[PDB]
Amino acid sequence: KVFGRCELAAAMKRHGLDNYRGYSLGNWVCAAKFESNFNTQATNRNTDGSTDYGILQINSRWWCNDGRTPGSRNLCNIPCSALLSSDITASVNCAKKIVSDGNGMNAWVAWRNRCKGTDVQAWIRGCRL
Ligand SMILES: *[C@@H]1O[C@H](CO)[C@@H](O[C@@H]2O[C@H](CO)[C@H](O)[C@H](O)[C@H]2O)[C@H](O)[C@H]1NC(C)=O
């Protein structure tokens, strides 16, 4: 499913991401925009053989099991395919663990490179949240 900008903002807010660990909602919407372009089915292979999954492009090397990343970790205790669901719940719960992992949103390279330090509020502008 490809979410609408405000549609995703609403879904994320409902799942308690607005200000989770001090990161305002716009940060999360911005990260999703550049990581997957709001598409829950996004997958991208990484250099070391692992793969990123979902709207938030979560890595199989550490967070989920895809059965093909020899010696990876599954810290979110879920199969990576669960991160591709039109229901973002699993992606949100796993992201909550990632952002609390000590490096905040820097875990998301698209966020560091294109969101961090910008007017992230523009991303939820116009939405009825
Ligand atoms: C993207 O890849 C990053 C590098 O592998 C990864 O960051 C690592 O996460 C580890 C989690 O146990 C640990 O904190 C390392 O110090 C850190 O470099 C990051 O989590 C990945 N991002 C996502 C969204 O999967």
Domain ranges of the chain: 1-129
Residue 16 and residue 25 in contact, taking contact as beta carbons nearer than 8 Å = no
Phi/psi for 40 (5° steps) reads -65, -25
Residue 52 identity: D
Protein residue with least CA distance to atom 19, ligand 1:
107
Experimental technique behind these coordinates: X-ray
Q: Tokens 């992230």 correspond to what residue?
A: 120
On whether 101 is known to bind a ligand per the annotation, the reply is: yes
Nearest 5°: phi and psi at 45? Answer: -80, 140
Q: Is 112 helix (H, G, I), strand (E, B) or coil?
A: helix
Atom 13 of ligand 1, residue of closest alpha carbon: 101
User: What's the resolution in A?
Assistant: 1.9
Given its phi and psi angles, is residue 40 left (phi above 0), alpha (psi -120 to 50 degrees) or beta? alpha
Catalytic residues: 35, 52
Q: What angle do CA 45, 82, 68 make, to 5 degrees?
A: 40
Tell me how far apart the alpha carbons of residues 5 and 24 are, in angstroms, rounded to a whole number: 15
| H-assigned helices in 37-119 | 89-99, 109-114
**Rounded distance, CA 104 to CA 22, Å?**
9
Among the listed residues 109, 92, 98, the one whose alpha carbon sits nearest the alpha carbon of residue 75: 98
Going from the Cα of 103 to the center of ligand 1, the distance in angstroms, rounded, reads: 9
Q: What angle do CA 7, 8, 11 make, to 5 degrees?
A: 90
Topology given in CATH for the domain delimited by 1-129: Lysozyme (1.10.530)
